[PDB]
Amino acid sequence: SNMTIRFADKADCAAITEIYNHAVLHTAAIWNDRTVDTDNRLAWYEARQLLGYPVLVSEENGVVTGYASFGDWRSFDGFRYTVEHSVYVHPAHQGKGLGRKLLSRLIDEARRCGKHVMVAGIESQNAASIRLHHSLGFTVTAQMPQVGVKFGRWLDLTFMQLQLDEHAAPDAC
């Protein structure tokens, strides 16, 4: 059968690491300059599993073409219904609808996990990501000039968010 969106396995972690490292080296999407090893992303993957948070891959005849996941925006208790997510498509497979397929599914999984808000931290010149999010119902709630640096230049940050329900705020426990 053919492309699939599925939950990642531990064995996907090397493909994930390669995509992650490419984004570190070649995009303004990750505001760090540290490439990592397979075990780093394995530990990341496992921490997500422990919280029951999805790590998703897109695949075509058995090869990983992209990934998506979310985690807590911040570790403090008051943020426990807000997640910050990310989507990375292998550079050779970008512009083919995989980002929308991954994010669409991630939204479903966020609703399943009981989350209230998804937060996208997008570098302001990333028109593809801003459009991707717009098309899945996200709205711009921040525009923060010169709060990042990479490649020797200031970066601007756009926050976009999607509120997943209109429920009342939960109790303490």
Q: Which residues bind ligand ACO (CB under 6 A)?
A: 23, 27, 29, 85-89, 94-100, 120-122, 126-129, 131-132, 135
Q: Which helix (H) or strand (E) holds 133?
A: helix 127-135
Does the protein bind a second copy through residue 36 (CB under 8 A)?
no
Does the protein bind a second copy through residue 1 (CB under 8 A)?
no
Half-sphere exposure of 38 (CA within 13 A, CB side): 6
In the complex, minimum distance from the CB of residue 1 to ligand ACO, in angstroms, rounded to a whole number: 20
In the complex, minimum distance from the CB of residue 152 to a second copy, in angstroms, rounded to a whole number: 6
Cα separation, 81 vs 70, whole angstroms? 12
First vs last Cα of the chain: how many Å apart?
44
Please check whether residue 69 is in contact with residue 86, taking contact to mean a CB–CB distance below 8 angstroms: yes
* Binding partner of residue 26 among a second copy, ligand ACO, Cl ion, none, CB cut-off 5 to 8 Å per kind: Cl ion
In the complex, minimum distance from the CB of residue 102 to ligand ACO, in angstroms, rounded to a whole number: 7
CB-based contacts of 85, cutoff 8 Å, min separation 6: 68, 69, 70, 71, 103, 106, 110, 118, 119, 120
Neighbours of 33 (CB within 10 A): 10
* Binding partner of residue 89 among ligand ACO, Cl ion, a second copy, none, CB cut-off 5 to 8 Å per kind: ligand ACO
Neighbours of 142 (CB within 10 A): 14
Pairing of strands 63-72, 82-89: antiparallel
In the complex, minimum distance from the CB of residue 63 to ligand ACO, in angstroms, rounded to a whole number: 14
Residue 139 pairs with which residues in a beta bridge?
161
Residues 128-167 as x/- pattern, contact with Cl ion by CB under 5 A? -----------xx------------------------xx-
Does the protein bind Cl ion through residue 46 (CB under 5 A)?
no
Provide the binding-site residues for a second copy, judged by CB under 8 A. 30-34, 73-74, 76-82, 116-117, 119, 141-150, 152-155, 159, 161, 163, 169-172
